[PDB]
Amino acid sequence: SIVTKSIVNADAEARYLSPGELDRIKAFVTGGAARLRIAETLTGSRETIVKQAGDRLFQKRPDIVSPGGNAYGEEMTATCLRDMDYYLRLVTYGVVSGDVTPIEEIGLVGVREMYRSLGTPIEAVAQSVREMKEVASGLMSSDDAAEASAYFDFVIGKMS
Amino acid sequence: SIVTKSIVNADAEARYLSPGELDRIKAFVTGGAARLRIAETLTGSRETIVKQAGDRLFQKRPDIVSPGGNAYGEEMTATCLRDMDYYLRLVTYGVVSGDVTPIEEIGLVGVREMYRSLGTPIEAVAQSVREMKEVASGLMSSDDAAEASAYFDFVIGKMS
Amino acid sequence: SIVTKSIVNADAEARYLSPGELDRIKAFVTGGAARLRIAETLTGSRETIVKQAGDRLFQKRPDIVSPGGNAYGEEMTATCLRDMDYYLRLVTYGVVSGDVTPIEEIGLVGVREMYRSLGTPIEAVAQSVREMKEVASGLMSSDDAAEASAYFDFVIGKMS
Amino acid sequence: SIVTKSIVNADAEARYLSPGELDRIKAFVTGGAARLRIAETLTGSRETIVKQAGDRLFQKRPDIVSPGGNAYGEEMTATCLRDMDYYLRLVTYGVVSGDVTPIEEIGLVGVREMYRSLGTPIEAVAQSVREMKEVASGLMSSDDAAEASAYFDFVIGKMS
Amino acid sequence: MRMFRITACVPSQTRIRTQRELQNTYFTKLVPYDNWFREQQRIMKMGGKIVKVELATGRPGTNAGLA
Amino acid sequence: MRDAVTTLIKNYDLTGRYLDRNAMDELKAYFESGSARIAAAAMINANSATIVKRAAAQLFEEIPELIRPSGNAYTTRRFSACLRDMDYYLRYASYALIAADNNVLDERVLQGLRETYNSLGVPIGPTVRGIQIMKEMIEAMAEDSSLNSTDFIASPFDHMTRELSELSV
Amino acid sequence: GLGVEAQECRNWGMQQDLFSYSAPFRKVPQFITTFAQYDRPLPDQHVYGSGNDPLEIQFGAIFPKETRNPSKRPAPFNKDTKRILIHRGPAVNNQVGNPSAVGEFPGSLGAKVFRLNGGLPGAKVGKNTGTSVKFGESSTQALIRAAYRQVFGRDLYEGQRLSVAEIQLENGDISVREFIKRLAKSELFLKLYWAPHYVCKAIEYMHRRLLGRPTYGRQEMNQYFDIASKQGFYAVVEAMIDSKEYSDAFGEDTVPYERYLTPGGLQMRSARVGSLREDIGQRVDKEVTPRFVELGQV
Amino acid sequence: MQDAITAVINSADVQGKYLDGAAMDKLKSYFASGELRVRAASVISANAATIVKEAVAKSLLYSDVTRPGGNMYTTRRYAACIRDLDYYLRYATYAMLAGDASILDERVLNGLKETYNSLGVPISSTVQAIQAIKEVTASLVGADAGKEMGVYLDYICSGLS
Amino acid sequence: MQDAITAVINSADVQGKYLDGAAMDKLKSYFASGELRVRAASVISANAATIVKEAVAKSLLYSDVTRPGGNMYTTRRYAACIRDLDYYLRYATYAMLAGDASILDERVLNGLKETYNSLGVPISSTVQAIQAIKEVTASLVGADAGKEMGVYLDYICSGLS
Amino acid sequence: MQDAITAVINSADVQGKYLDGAAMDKLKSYFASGELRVRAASVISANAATIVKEAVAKSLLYSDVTRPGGNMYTTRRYAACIRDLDYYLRYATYAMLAGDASILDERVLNGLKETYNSLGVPISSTVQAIQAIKEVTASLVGADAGKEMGVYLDYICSGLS
Ligand SMILES: *[C@H](C)[C@H]1/C(=C/c2[nH]c(/C=C3N=C(/C=C4\NC(=O)C(CC)=C4C)C(C)=C\3CCC(=O)O)c(CCC(=O)O)c2C)NC(=O)[C@@H]1C
């Protein structure tokens, strides 16, 4: 979290917390209500975001779900939607934490090696997260959509 | 029916029915035997038209039954074939009545709003009804197909 | 325009402009500079948005540019990009006017039967407008994308 | 109020509120402190605005207080000043609500029929409210007196 | 009373009517004097062009006897 | 006659639902406000006669035409009827303060009050003026006294004022 | 009564009407109806009372009478209180939620629409004399009869028809809007539907005939009542014809038709033993031949 | 409104089934009776005013209804009663052609009893006029078609009484 | 209709006095809530159709209401039910923006029970549909503004009671 | 109230003349059908609760109305609906025994429509319940007595509508 980063940056140079870190933590605390609202509407609409974004992904990229594809079959399609729900949950965790380090520590270290072992196209996973970004950004106000799309675009950058 | 149309026009003009409407009504009454024959053929072979036209629809438009489509899944495919069976039943109603009034009142007013709320592509539903038209036209006699084709492409025109 | 709408309402009630409507004119005049900023960003990036959104449309629906489709051939693709350019020009007019009235008056009434007579899939043109929305939101400012997306999805809802 | 006016207009158009209307409501609820400061200014100076404006009206149109006039006498002069205070209270209500609807539902519909039943000169009451506007602009700052003068000028236009 | 003979052409602007619309698009009709202002304003806010108007009945400058 | 718990039960019963966390939160809010409601009602019982006398005095000095000829507080019969009506308003306001609901006010005060006042010529404007005068003096007395929560006191009087009042705008 | 004891302020008007000697002639149970309408919201009723609603029949402004069999049901309708009306045609063509569908014709669900779709006879001098079977005149005469029926819901008599207005519309000197205007401004309409009725009753019935629509409420009724007070019945007719909703629903060639209904009128039309559909307020069990009959069948 | 065909179609639609054997039998019965219905409707449309004339001669004329103090006294009230009987005969012909009384309940009997009780119209005299229409129609048209018309005329009698 | 500001102005005008400090406090409270109300209204106006879609899928779809013999069976009745849920969502958004249920009293609940009883519309099924709208809107907007919307949706339900 | 005897007596009395032969044929028909009316009333009085039970099971059970939010949700309102159907069946037997629908218009109908409108009672659904009562009664008693009961049950439905 932002609190974790500020405490770590103070402790690395072995001092108490600077006024800049206090101002940053104060901004984190004041934006906590809006961040909690964004996380609340994401976890409330968690099923329809995954459903609509998976539908848009499978319409835009039929090759991953056609026979010979990585996600062909109902079980592999359900596993792909489970992965999309996993990344939406990590997006909600990042929205709560105010930064990107829970998404990084849980689902973005070794993601390329994992999906290379799985045989899954990582650019198609990034397309799935981009469709989740578009569907979720259509479900909020403009500032909330930009704030959530920041974490979404971090996941896009880590996947591609 | 044409009887209800003639009585509605006579009621609107506050007069007894015109003798022209009288021979059109007795002509419909005498020619209703062929209408009952067409309705008997469609009722007897109702699952055959639905099955073949559904297969031809899903081959022509694979996106609606691919994942991400509106009709993906066995229960959604069964619901789509139930909708096709509903429209075939309405076609039999129109053939029996001699008029497009039961078809329009039961399953064509607000169809665009209904399918827009459901997310179903109305042009693909029109393609489904067109496939039912081709299967039934190949399945019955030429004059019977020409008689049923007026109701069929009335449904096509109202959907498109 | 909201100026035109306020004058129409004032002449409908046969009266001068109410102070709330005058304050609406105040707010519209104030926001016209930012709306014009949206306008020159869109008309400066009109070529890239149209070309790359048309390419994304071609990859999404390859049957459009395939032989046997509507947009097969260099002159047919020229007409397709001309339609894209016309619709984006209407969106620039809409973000200039602050209202959907120029789009609805120039290029959004009777488009269903127009493209029915042309044989063009209205779902395909709606998908093209959706890709133009996505490319414009990616290439253009985000609150300004929320401004332009009202006109964009008004076009989406009217065509589809 | 502005909220009720926007809801009435959107209900007549059978739609939700426009984003411009929502931005106007946001501007209204941010400027709430300023307009309630105008309200407390007017309630502080309620008895002085009517005093100076009645003095200006009586020195401008002495036929009002001449014998045979509508407001001849002590008690009729008191009733005239009470109507002046009523209109000042309605202007206070209007600048609080942000709309001229609380002004016009109480003191502008049927005012001509009421004052022709009472024999009162409507243009002289309009001149009285003009003098109230000038006194309020005297003991008020520039832009806020322009803001209150919008509603005052609505009263002048709808009365005269 | 005094009547106005008018000739007008109004366009359709909101929807494409599928029925025959000559009789309400281009038409000539008799409108009364007291109703010509509201009838004209209805056409003029509708968006048509009144190409002709004349006083069919009565004479100009009729102080008394206009009814 | 329905209090807050009863109208919450009726609202959930209409939908056929069990009491969820929102319902338990509303019941917890009512049960934590209930001590302040009981203290406020005991205060209402304490100063009832003096508050109706001084509220009537404030009403008749604000609108002096009521106690004059052609007014509807003219005789002592009209005066005692006005005092009885104001005491009725205070008593049912106490009932609504205990119940935390204005359904008692709707069922037993407001559903025929316009009809009776139009039948007998009793004004409806000075009536709600006296009701609001009672509201201001009771709220000031509760602010003076050791009452932690005083926000709920204005709700029955403002409900009476809005329901009995005439739609100006 | 009133002075004997303290009177409870919940059965005031019901007790006042009950203590009169006319109580055994009100057969409407007033107490239970008012006590139920106390709990429930505002009913399907005209803003000026239950007696201000005509029967939704073809002709005849049949109103409830306050004295004969007293059935008055007052309800405190405020100014901007729109009455929910039921559209005759498609339900999505209701102008409350779809205001751009005012001009949509209710095909096969609403009333029949009569228009000047055919050309009027003698419109052009292309048929230079002769031309015995100039075909479109029976359609125009049926249009005249339909306009007559809409203004006065029944067919008229011989001396009552406005033959000069008929001839002017048939020649094309006036349009359908001015023809309906003259039919409503005729003294026959004044004698039949304006003079024998209460003023707001006549305003409401005339709105239902000239627009096919009950009034939404106090705003429109106040407007037409103020016009009736100031200028009179001819000007209320003029304002009703020149209203924007009239021009939106009906053109210069369209005779008015019944577009909206009250819920009570629709209940009277389609709640009888006949014309009531099987799935309106009934559980429709899917009737099937029994499974043992199916197994015993060959 | 609805005819017998539309009634069968609506029953099958609400019941959620196709046209089974009994529905086709009802449609065949209606198609059998349709020629008789058309012939009877043509006969009534020919002799429309004669039925009402013979009915008022048989049932209403030379009585206290026609005499002063009666409801059918004035020429206006006489023309009103003649128009009412014209409407009743025309809508009974409509119901005879359709094979259903839905148009009778939708456009005639809705509020008709309340209308006649508000106007003071004699219910018994109007019923006797409809019975006179029934026997004159049965004499002028035929036996089976006269019975078919009399079913809907008795439906109007039951709805009005 | 009356919002909070117009209700305060109406109360003070029937009082006959100017706005005292309690009017200032109520106005400032409404202005404090106004930004949350505007944000909720914007989100609901953007997602108007999807809330109705999820509510119909949650409550009315695949039931006897939409099966043959049901009142949501025929597609004009289905589109009417969709438009009714759009009515309830839009007017609940209006009531949440106004901070008052006066518009629901004047335009939504005015004769709605008699309307639905005349039509045959299922009262408890549309109550469950409004309940599904309430749950979907509370999931889509949040606890606070969802609760505020649910107050007026429950007001519509209790009017339908 | 009036039975058939008092009806023909008052019809003779209003015009002031004595009984003719045509008035005597009314009494001949009534005394022909009197013992059928007696045995039908005995059967329905024997099975009075059973008809209401099968009618509610046929039409009203498992519909929207018994579900929460419906008009027959609470057990008190269910008992009130059973009470209303007992009223309708008993007064229909009264009208069947009298041979004239005066008791229905005098004690059941003249004041019931607006009472049901004030209570919110669905008039179309209770008309369908009365139709179910008619079907079960016609199954129990017979064809002629069943349609004789159905005439007055349709009279109750027409008074409600
Ligand atoms: C098949 C050609 C296409 C398609 C179908 C599809 N439909 C639905 C869902 C429904 N469709 C209806 C429609 C009707 N009801 C009627 O009574 C009539 C006329 C007689 C019609 C046309 C209804 C009511 C439903 C809802 C089902 C229910 O009973 O609750 C679905 C399911 C959508 C979902 O998400 O559940 C589908 C898939 N989809 C296609 O792609 C084909 C083009």
Ligand SMILES: *[C@H](C)[C@H]1/C(=C/c2[nH]c(/C=C3N=C(/C=C4\NC(=O)C(CC)=C4C)C(C)=C\3CCC(=O)O)c(CCC(=O)O)c2C)NC(=O)[C@@H]1C
């Ligand atoms: C197309 C061949 C050329 C053309 C078309 C064009 N048409 C209009 C509008 C109208 N057309 C008519 C014509 C008719 N109305 C009828 O009822 C009938 C007979 C059944 C005819 C022939 C009318 C009346 C109009 C006016 C609008 C209306 O529909 O009432 C326009 C103008 C549209 C506008 O106002 O913007 C145009 C441009 N122009 C061409 O260049 C094509 C070669």
Ligand SMILES: *[C@H](C)[C@H]1/C(=C/c2[nH]c(/C=C3N=C(/C=C4\NC(=O)C(CC)=C4C)C(C)=C\3CCC(=O)O)c(CCC(=O)O)c2C)NC(=O)[C@@H]1C
């Ligand atoms: C003291 C020697 C005198 C006196 C003074 C006084 N009176 C009031 C107020 C009221 N007086 C009345 C009296 C009447 N009502 C009637 O119908 C009749 C005729 C039989 C009478 C005499 C009433 C009702 C009031 C209260 C209403 C009001 O304020 O006027 C006051 C004021 C008390 C206060 O301000 O609280 C005073 C000081 N009354 C006498 O009888 C003595 C002559």
Ligand SMILES: *[C@H](C)[C@H]1/C(=C/c2[nH]c(/C=C3N=C(/C=C4\NC(=O)C(CC)=C4C)C(C)=C\3CCC(=O)O)c(CCC(=O)O)c2C)NC(=O)[C@@H]1C
């Ligand atoms: C005093 C604030 C105002 C006033 C009062 C006044 N009221 C009446 C008479 C009646 N008031 C009622 C009202 C109620 N009955 C109830 O049961 C309840 C709630 C428990 C109420 C509020 C009734 C029924 C009457 C009539 C008989 C009676 O007193 O019970 C009068 C008398 C008028 C007369 O001439 O008889 C008066 C004077 N008048 C004002 O001016 C003050 C604004």
Ligand SMILES: *[C@H](C)[C@H]1/C(=C/c2[nH]c(/C=C3N=C(/C=C4\NC(=O)C(CC)=C4C)C(C)=C\3CCC(=O)O)c(CCC(=O)O)c2C)NC(=O)[C@@H]1C
């Ligand atoms: C005599 C000048 C002509 C004539 C007369 C004739 N009349 C009838 C029958 C009826 N005439 C009326 C007329 C009225 N009743 C009224 O109350 C009024 C207005 C005050 C009028 C005008 C009526 C009602 C009848 C019906 C009989 C009845 O009153 O009960 C007849 C008999 C027709 C028949 O065939 O029975 C005749 C012969 N006939 C002529 O040729 C003279 C020109």
Ligand SMILES: *[C@H](C)[C@H]1/C(=C/c2[nH]c(/C=C3N=C(/C=C4\NC(=O)C(CC)=C4C)C(C)=C\3CCC(=O)O)c(CCC(=O)O)c2C)NC(=O)[C@@H]1C
């Ligand atoms: C004739 C058999 C007996 C009779 C008739 C009579 N009727 C009227 C006048 C009216 N009749 C109606 C009835 C209807 N309204 C409808 O919508 C329909 C179905 C389409 C019907 C049948 C109405 C409304 C009137 C009122 C006037 C009008 O026509 O609009 C009268 C005149 C009563 C009067 O006061 O004018 C009479 C006399 N009365 C008899 O005695 C005959 C036995």
Ligand SMILES: *[C@H](C)[C@H]1/C(=C/c2[nH]c(/C=C3N=C(/C=C4\NC(=O)C(CC)=C4C)C(C)=C\3CCC(=O)O)c(CCC(=O)O)c2C)NC(=O)[C@@H]1C
């Ligand atoms: C959907 C949740 C349920 C349902 C609905 C249903 N509604 C109708 C038709 C109408 N609904 C209204 C209601 C209103 N009109 C208004 O102006 C307002 C406030 C803005 C409301 C709430 C009306 C008037 C109608 C009649 C059509 C019209 O719009 O004029 C129907 C159709 C009835 C029919 O027989 O076609 C239906 C089916 N039914 C269900 O089963 C769902 C539970």
Ligand SMILES: *[C@H](C)[C@H]1/C(=C/c2[nH]c(/C=C3N=C(/C=C4\NC(=O)C(CC)=C4C)C(C)=C\3CCC(=O)O)c(CCC(=O)O)c2C)NC(=O)[C@@H]1C
């Ligand atoms: C179970 C403990 C016993 C029992 C139950 C049983 N009940 C029914 C049917 C119904 N029961 C009710 C009762 C209520 N509805 C309410 O809303 C409430 C209060 C909240 C009550 C108490 C109703 C209305 C029905 C009808 C179903 C419907 O919704 O329409 C049955 C079925 C009877 C049938 O023939 O269908 C049964 C079997 N039976 C036992 O033996 C247990 C002792």
